[PDB]
Amino acid sequence: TLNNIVSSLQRNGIFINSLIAALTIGGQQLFSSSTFSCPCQVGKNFYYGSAFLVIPALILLVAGFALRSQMWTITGEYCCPLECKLACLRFFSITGRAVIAPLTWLAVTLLTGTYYECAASEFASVDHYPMFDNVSASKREEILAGFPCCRSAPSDVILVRDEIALLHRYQSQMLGWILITLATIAALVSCCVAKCCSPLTSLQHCYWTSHLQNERELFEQAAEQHSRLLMMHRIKKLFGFIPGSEDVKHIRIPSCQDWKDISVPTL
Amino acid sequence: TLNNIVSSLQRNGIFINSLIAALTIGGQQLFSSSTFSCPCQVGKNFYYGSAFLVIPALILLVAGFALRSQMWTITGEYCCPLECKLACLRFFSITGRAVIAPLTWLAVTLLTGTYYECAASEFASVDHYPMFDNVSASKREEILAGFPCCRSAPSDVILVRDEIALLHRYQSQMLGWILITLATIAALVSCCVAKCCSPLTSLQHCYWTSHLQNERELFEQAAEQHSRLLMMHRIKKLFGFIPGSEDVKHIRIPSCQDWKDISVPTL
Amino acid sequence: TLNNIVSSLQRNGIFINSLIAALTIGGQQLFSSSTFSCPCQVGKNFYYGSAFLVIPALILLVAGFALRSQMWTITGEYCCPLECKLACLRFFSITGRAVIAPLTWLAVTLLTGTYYECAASEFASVDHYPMFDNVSASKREEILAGFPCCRSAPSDVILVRDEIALLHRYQSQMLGWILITLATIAALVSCCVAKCCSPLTSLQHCYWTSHLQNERELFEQAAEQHSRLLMMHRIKKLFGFIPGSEDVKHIRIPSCQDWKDISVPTL
Amino acid sequence: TLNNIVSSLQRNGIFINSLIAALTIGGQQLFSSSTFSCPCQVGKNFYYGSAFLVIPALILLVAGFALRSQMWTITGEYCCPLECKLACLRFFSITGRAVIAPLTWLAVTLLTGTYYECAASEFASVDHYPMFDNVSASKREEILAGFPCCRSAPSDVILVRDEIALLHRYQSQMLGWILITLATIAALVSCCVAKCCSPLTSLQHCYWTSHLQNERELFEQAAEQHSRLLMMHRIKKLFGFIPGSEDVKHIRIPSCQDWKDISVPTL
Amino acid sequence: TLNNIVSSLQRNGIFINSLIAALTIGGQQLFSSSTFSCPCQVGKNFYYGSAFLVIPALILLVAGFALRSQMWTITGEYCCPLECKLACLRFFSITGRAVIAPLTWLAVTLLTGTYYECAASEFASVDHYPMFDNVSASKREEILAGFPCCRSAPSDVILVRDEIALLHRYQSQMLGWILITLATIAALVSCCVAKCCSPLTSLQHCYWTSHLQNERELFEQAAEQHSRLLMMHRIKKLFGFIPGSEDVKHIRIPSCQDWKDISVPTL
Amino acid sequence: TLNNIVSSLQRNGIFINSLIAALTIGGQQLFSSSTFSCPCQVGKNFYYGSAFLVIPALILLVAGFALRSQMWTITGEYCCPLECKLACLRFFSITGRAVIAPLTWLAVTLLTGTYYECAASEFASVDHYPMFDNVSASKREEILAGFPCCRSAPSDVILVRDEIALLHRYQSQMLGWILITLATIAALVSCCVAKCCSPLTSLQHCYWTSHLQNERELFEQAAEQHSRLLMMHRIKKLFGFIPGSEDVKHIRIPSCQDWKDISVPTL
Amino acid sequence: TLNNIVSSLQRNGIFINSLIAALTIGGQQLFSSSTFSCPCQVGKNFYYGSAFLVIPALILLVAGFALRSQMWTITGEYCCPLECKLACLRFFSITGRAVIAPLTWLAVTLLTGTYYECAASEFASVDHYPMFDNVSASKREEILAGFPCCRSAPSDVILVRDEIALLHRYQSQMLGWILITLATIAALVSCCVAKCCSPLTSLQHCYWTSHLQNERELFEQAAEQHSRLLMMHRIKKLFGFIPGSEDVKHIRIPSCQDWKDISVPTL
């Protein structure tokens, strides 16, 4: 009864997507809490933010795309009528499985907001503040870039720093919610257009998916058994018996040529 | 049902790669936290950093290459047409399995950044600082090399030290992300060119891999059983019975010559 | 299914080597943390270091060599053509299994570096220091040998002591990495030359190894059963029945001579 | 499958030797930490040290010798050609099993070194010290014997005490390592000469050992069953039935003489 | 498989002796730590020590002697040629089993030494001490007997008290080691003379021991079954059926005389 | 296999005696630590001590005597030749089982000694003390009886109190050891005289004990089954069927007289 | 094997009595520690003590008497020769089972003594005290009744209070021990006279007890089965089938009269 429920869960795409999202959330939390520290330099801040903000998303998207076995077969069908549309729907299902990880990464890393603070701590619009009128541009950038990591100045500085930080947190969380909403709407309309352009009815689709799955599994098992039988026959030609038999009555000692015979596997 | 899932996991290259990466991450964490200490000498710092940065990567790469049994057979096929391409694809799969460990080692040890600080704490560009103009070159190197390990000087020194350390941490993490991105792109394009140059179709590849695996396993088992039968027959010639039989009726006491007979195994 | 995986692991030389290395690492850690203390005398320091550095390596190497049963049989074949090369390859495999322990001992005890500090705390090159010019040679050695174990002097002394200790730690860890690299290169080229000088092909080697293993096991079991049958027959001659039978109908009481008969085992 | 692995471990002499060594190490640790205290008298110190250093070794050696059943049979063969050499090899195996305990006791109790400090705290060579010139011989011995257990004097006394203690610890640990090395070399050359003087080949030895083991076991079981049958027959002569039968139809009440009959066991 | 190993351990005299020794050690530790307190009177100290030192040893020796069932049968054989020697060897084995407990009690209670301090705290040789010259004999005994339990006097008194206590601890532990060595030597030479005077060979001894054990067990079981059958027959004569039968067809109501019949068991 | 070892332990009188002794020790410890407090009155102390010292011993002895079922049957045989001696031996075995509890109670409560202090704190021989010469007899008793429970007076009083308490503890523990030794000697000589006066040989005794045990058990079971059959037959006469049968075909409704029939059980 | 030991324990009256005594001890401890508080009024103290001292004993005695099923049947035999004596012995056994609870309640609540202090804190004999001569009778009672619960007066008052409390504790514990001894003696002599007046022999008693037990059990089971069969037959007359049958072929729908038929159970 164990493998029954195991396969029932494996079929559930919802469970797999939930597992992927939860693992990405935990990994993002650990990654941020462990190996993140603002450089607070003059020009090397925005890049340090955008790297952690963007690069893991691209990496996880590429990983979700390439790690899917069926994607390789589909590309091989494409790489050097109805088949085109069915391949399009297969590619669509693969993309739907893959997109979950980078999307949840972006969403969580924006809702936490600590990356955006260190990302755009230099573009802060400072125009109506009492302490930022006399200072030159260079020292202005210098004292503005020192806000995110630490604080050491009198109370007015920490007040304006908290204000700027709260503004940037608001901007980050708003961007995160906008991304969530836009992504959900896009996914919904994409599933809708996929249902619209599907040449199969509601029932033929189920049969088609089951057909693809069963095809891959059965061909794997059958090719395995066939090659096993062939190698067993070559072994019987070499030694003179079957590896599975018991109390073998004839044992043919190999000669110096039959080793050369078995050296090549005939591909 | 246990061995079913055990073999199912063993087949999953993703699981094995995840295990290798996690073990390397844990080992790197323990290794760094336990047996690392900056020498903070005048010329013996960059080497102390580059050693921990580089040598374990080379060692783990060589270990991932040599520990693969199939690699030895392939090299023996090479060491003193279609076969060439199939051997190339096998070598490619072995390299794909092996490269994971040193890559993750480099990635984690750069993202942590504590090795790079002690690695290039001497090349620090000190040109626009108030305390480093009057001091001579030798004492400048002396006070610059004492930054990474400890702090003992007044507040200006600790301020410039924190600034230099943050700059170097930024550089280290940027190098780590660049390495990650470049490596992922290289792996993707390499899998692409491997799919392009493959003389087999999408289905022949599965049969070929299953064929190699089954060939190795079946030949091992068959050679074992054959040698066991041969040694059992020599034992029956020595003592006069089969090691597996029960209630043996004839027991031939060995003579002083038959010991010499069994002394050599006939290779 | 238990003994299946047990034997599968036992076959894996990688698992056994990993276990040996981990056990040696743990033992070295406990040994160093428990029963090590620097004597800090004038001439009795370098020996106290080199002992812990060297002697356990030699002991573990001898233990890895002598504890291998096959090594005794090979030496007996040597002690008072093709056979020579096959024995050479067997000796090579035994050496490959054995060398792991002293190598990992040296590697870990050098990477930790605490043994090297107490080993060469007397050869410290003291030529450009402000406090070591007026002092005579004897008191110089006296105050130099008191550095590794403890500290009791003013701040200049502890500063120069920390500098010397860091220099020696750097030297120790560099020597450790050099040893690791040289040993790995030597092992690789030795496996290469072993593959080069092997008179067997890639397939004959597998059969040969399985043959040796099965030969030893089957001969053990067969000799055991034969001697058991012989002793059972002598027991039947003494008492008048078989130790395995039930409801024995005849019981021959032994006489005063048959005890003398069974006193000798006929070798 | 339990008793399979139990017997497999029992055969492994390495496991038994490891267990003996570990138990002796633990016992020595507990014994030293619990019931040891330096008397710090004038002439009663060296004996108090040498007792704990020596006597347990002799006791454990005698225990390892006498507790071996086969040793008693061999001595009986000796006590009031080829047989001599085979008995010599058996005695050698027994000695090899037995020697492990006192050797590890000496090794651990010397490496810990706390016994040697209290053992030779009187032979300390005091000739170049500032406080030991004016004092007479008797008070010199008195203040020298009070060093190991406690300290109560000014700083110069505790300094010279720590120096003497470190010197004696160095001497103790050096003696321990010398003992370890000499013992390992002796054991190796003794196994070598045992292999040299063995009249049996490499294969006859295995058969001989299995023969001895099976002989002892089978004779025990057979003698047990024979005596059981004889006593069962005497019981049937007394009461009139077999202790194993059920629904016995005849019950012979014993008479006043048959009790005298069963009083003696006929030896 | 449980009772197999249970009986295998029960046969091992080494295991039983180890259990007895460990239990006696634990009991001695608890007994000493719980219910021991020095009276520190003038004449009632040596007895309070010697009681705990001696009486438990005698009690445990008598318990080890009398609790052995075979000892009672042997004494009955003695109480109102070859048989004499065999009974002597049986008595020897019983003594060897029994002596372990009082010996280990004495050994542990002497090695701990706290009993000997309170035992001979009055015989202290006080002849060369500065405070014990003017005091009379009575007050001398009074202040000497107050040392073991407590301390309340100035520093010179506590110094001489610690010296006397250390001297007595040394004496106690030396006596303990002497007892251990003498006892082991006596046991060894006694086993030797037992092997010398044994009229049986090495093999007849095993048969004899197995014979004694099997004799006792089989006679117990057979006598039990015989008496059970006899009582079952008397019950059938009383009630009219067998206690083991089912669906009994005849039930004989007992009369007023048959109760008198069953009142006596005919011995 | 459970009930096998359960009955094997139940047969072991040593195990039952150990359990009784341990339970009595624990109960005495709890009883003393919980509900004991010295009254410290003028004449009501010795009784308060002797009660706890004596009464539980008598109670436990009576409980060990009366709770034995066989003792009741033996007394009934006595209450209104060879039989006399056999009954004497049975009574002896019962007494040997019973005496353990009060003896261990006395032993432990004397070795702890806290009961004896409160028992004879009035008979203290006070004749050579500096503070007890001027005081009258009444106040002397008053201040002497206040020693065991509490202390409130100056240091001389607490000193003499500790001295008296230590003297009484010594007396108590000496009495306890004397009781232990005398009791063990008495038990040994009593077992000896029981072996001397036994009319049975060593083997007839085993048969006799097994006979008594089996007699009681078998008669119980047989009487139970007989009465069960009789009541089942009366039930069949009442209702018309057997309580064990199924699908009974005839059901006889009872009449107003048969209830009167079943009202009496015919004894 | 579970129910075997369960019934074996249930038969053991000793186990049931131990359980009852332990439960009563625990309940008394909890009851006293939870809901007891001295009123310390002028006339309402002795009643508050005697209530907790007496009433629970009477309640537990009545509960032990009435809760026994056999007691009801015996009383019904009595309520509106040999039978009289057998009923007397049955009543005796019931009383022996029942009396344990109130006796142990009284014993424990007297040995703890806290109830007796609050019970007779007014009858304190105050005649030779320095502070109780001038005070009138009313205030004397007032200050005497305030002793048990609390203390608030100077040291002389607390001294005389502790003295009175210790006197009353002594009296309480003495009364408890007297009760224990008298009760045990009464129980012993009562069992003796019960054995004396028993018209049955030692063996007829066992049969009689087993007869009573089996009679009750078998009659219960048989009456149950008979009534079940009768109701099943009435159900078959109502509906037309048996409640236990399967695939019933005829189903008789009930009419408006047969409901009236089944309305009465015919008693």
Residue numbers in the entry:
A (entry chain D), B (entry chain C), C (entry chain B), D (entry chain A), E (entry chain J), F (entry chain I), ...: 4 to 83, 94 to 280
The authors write:
In each case, we found a heterogeneous, about equal distribution of particles with two distinct oligomeric states. The smaller particles are composed of decameric and the larger of undecameric assemblies, both of which we refer to as CALHM4 channels. Due to the slightly higher quality of the Ca2+-free sample, we continued to use this data for our further analysis unless specifically indicated. The cryo-EM density of the decamers extends to a resolution of 4.1 Å and undecamers to 3.7 Å, which in both cases permitted the unambiguous interpretation by an atomic model. In each structure, the subunits are arranged around a central axis of symmetry that defines the ion-conduction path. Both assemblies contain pairs of CALHM4 channels of the same size related by two-fold symmetry that interact via their cytoplasmic parts. In the plane of the membrane, the dimensions of decameric and undecameric CALHM4 channels amount to 110 Å and 120 Å respectively. The diameter at both entrances of the pore measures about 52 Å and 60 Å for decameric and undecameric assemblies respectively, thus defining the properties of an unusually large channel, which could be permeable to molecular substrates. Even at the constriction located at the intracellular membrane leaflet where the respective N-terminal helices NH project towards the pore axis, the decameric channels are about 20 Å and undecameric channels 30 Å wide. In both cases the pore would thus be sufficiently large to accommodate an ATP molecule, consistent with the notion of CALHM proteins forming ATP-permeable channels.
